[PDB]
């Protein structure tokens, strides 16, 4: 009975931290092996009176108590564990008080209402009266959780305790109390929130510190989601209006970030009458981070309105703000704006997308910054779905040559991936005239991903344009660059063999495809033999039995005892897969 306490006290004092962790992570084993009333009687006062100097053990014991409250004997006997769990609140670390408050959240969740009405209310009212701020943070959390199981008089007592604690001067308990206001009204009725919660909410939003106003405005968006359409205009709406244009930029940054749930909560008439002019005030100010957030939110603000008025407000107010935001001297604002600009295209009608968004599209194409270019070129697929390929192709005619040679390979990657649609729409004659050279230079780039994308692009072209065109215009250049001393150029030619052989045909597979593969399997570079083994492995099934048995089998038995072990293994598994022997 006392020997567990003795080994606990001689084990908690050492050098390392792993041993106490292994002890208290298995303290539930000690409790279940020893008994129930024993650990109610002596072990709980033992863990109260001891004070440790390390923080992670407090986390582990808190979560162990949270998992242990079931092993205590059920919800009826958990009154023994409440003085220790409230004794854990007098700590100085954030993670351990978070673990403590979530443990007490679980305790409040699992437990039958009558002895919450009897016992937890004095405990939360007494730790609410604690002088330390951590006790008040735990108090406002516990008052946020203890609503639905108490009676009306006990309710009104905890409401007036909440007004007693929420009015104090020190800021961190006001932050915690504002967060618990945001979590608090999610369960209340309409009359109590419309009578006393919202005027003191306005009072707490009327103070000076920025962060209490931050937590106040997301508490405002929660209560706007909660309150019906009939009452929010008269009381909390001027509060959020006067909080919209405050002196600090943090509050307008947050109400920009929270603007979408605000406009979803209030309803379209309030958005048109009040939120739109404040939003023109939002993107047209001097701070630039709020401007980037304003672009990030003008995307999902324009997608979420009513149609018959969204068209008018975008043709009347939004587009001049877009034109002003494009010419902004800050760069990150332009990058974010170009990230979220062509999402307006499926929203907006066709000819208006042309006559407004395409000049700014071509403007954002030629910007010297890379992030704006990579964002707009990634969004070119989304604008490509709603705008027909013909006028988009004619728009990208003088802009396709500068974007195939720019520094960043993301833009080149997306241009290569998008190019088959452009070539298929735009015809074969133009590609044979002055557009094949771009793909030819793409096949010999430095970046591997660019070359692999160009090889898949070759697959798309041989699929979309036909057989004899690829015979006349693609294969001889592939062989001429197969005759290149550099090794990775030979790698790209092997990739061309593989990927163009996916469609290809049957006649060219033995008279201009196979012999070049055969004749260069004796290159001293082991990677050449490695990938010619891979190419033979893949190209096996498309070939017929005569060529597969005439010269493929002797070259594969030639390459299966060479010095490098990797090419030997892939030659062996190529012979295994192709069933050559």
């Amino acid at each position: 009975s006392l020997y567990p306490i003795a080994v606990l006290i001689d084990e908690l004092r050492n050098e390392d931290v792993q041993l106490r962790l292994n002890s208290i992570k298995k303290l539930s084993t000690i409790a279940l092996a020893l008994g129930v009333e024993r650990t109610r009687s002596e072990l709980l006062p033992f863990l109260t009176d001891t004070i440790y100097d390390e923080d992670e053990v407090l986390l582990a014991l808190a979560e162990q108590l949270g998992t242990f409250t079931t092993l205590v004997g059920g919800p009826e006997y958990v009154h023994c564990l409440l003085p220790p769990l409230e004794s854990l609140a007098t700590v100085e670390e954030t993670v351990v008080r978070d673990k403590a408050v979530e443990s007490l959240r679980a305790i409040s969740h699992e437990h039958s209402p009558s002895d919450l009405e009897a016992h937890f209310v004095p405990l939360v009212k007494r730790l609410a009266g604690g002088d330390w701020f951590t006790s008040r943070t735990s108090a406002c959390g516990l008052f946020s959780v203890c609503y639905p199981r108490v009676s009306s008089a006990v309710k009104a007592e905890l409401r007036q305790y909440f007004r007693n604690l929420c009015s104090d001067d020190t800021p961190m308990v006001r932050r915690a109390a504002a967060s618990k206001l945001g979590e608090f009204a999610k369960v209340l009725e309409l009359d109590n929130v419309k009578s006393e919660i919202i005027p003191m909410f306005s009072n707490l939003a009327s103070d000076e510190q920025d962060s209490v106003r931050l937590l106040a405005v997301e508490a405002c968006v929660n209560i706007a989601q909660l309150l019906p359409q009939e009452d929010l205009e008269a009381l909390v709406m001027p509060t959020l209006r006067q909080a919209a244009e405050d002196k600090s930029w943090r509050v307008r940054y947050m109400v920009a970030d929270k603007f979408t749930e605000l406009q979803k909560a209030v309803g379209p008439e309030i958005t048109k009458t009040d939120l739109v002019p404040a939003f023109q005030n939002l993107m047209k100010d001097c701070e630039a981070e709020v401007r980037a957030a304003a672009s990030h939110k003008v995307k999902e603000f324009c997608e979420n309105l009513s149609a018959d008025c969204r068209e008018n407000v975008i043709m009347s107010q939004i587009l001049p703000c877009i034109k002003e935001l494009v010419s902004d001297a800050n760069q990150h604002v332009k990058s974010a704006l170009a990230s979220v600009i062509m999402g307006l295209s499926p929203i907006l009608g066709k000819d208006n997308t042309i006559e407004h968004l395409l000049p700014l599209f071509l403007a954002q194409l030629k910007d010297e910054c890379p992030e704006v270019r990579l964002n707009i070129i990634s969004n070119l697929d989304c604008v490509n779905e709603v705008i027909g390929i013909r006028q988009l192709s004619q728009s990208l005619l003088p802009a396709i040559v500068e974007l195939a040679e720019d520094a960043k390979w993301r833009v080149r990657l997306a241009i290569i991936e998008y190019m088959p649609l452009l070539a298929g729409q735009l015809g074969v004659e133009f590609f044979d005239e002055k557009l094949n050279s771009l793909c030819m230079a793409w096949l010999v780039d430095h970046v591997y991903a660019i070359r692999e994308a160009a090889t898949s692009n070759l697959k798309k072209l041989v699929e979309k344009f036909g057989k004899e065109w690829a015979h006349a215009t693609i294969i001889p250049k592939v062989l001429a660059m197969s005759g290149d001393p550099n090794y990775l150029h030979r790698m790209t030619t092997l990739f061309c063999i593989n990927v163009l052989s996916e469609v290809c045909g049957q006649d060219i597979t033995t008279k201009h495809m196979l012999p070049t593969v055969l004749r260069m399997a004796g290159d001293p570079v082991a990677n050449v033999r490695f990938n010619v083994a891979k190419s033979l492995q893949k190209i096996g099934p498309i070939l017929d039995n005569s060529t597969l048995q005439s010269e493929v089998k002797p070259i594969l038995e030639k390459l299966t005892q060479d010095q490098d072990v990797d090419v030997k293994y892939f030659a062996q598994e190529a012979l295994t897969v192709l069933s050559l022997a």
Binding site: Y253, A288, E289, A292, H332, V333
Partner: peptide, 6 residues
């Protein structure tokens, strides 16, 4: 570097 992140 226009990212205060506060």
């Amino acid at each position: 570097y226009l990212k205060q992140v506060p």
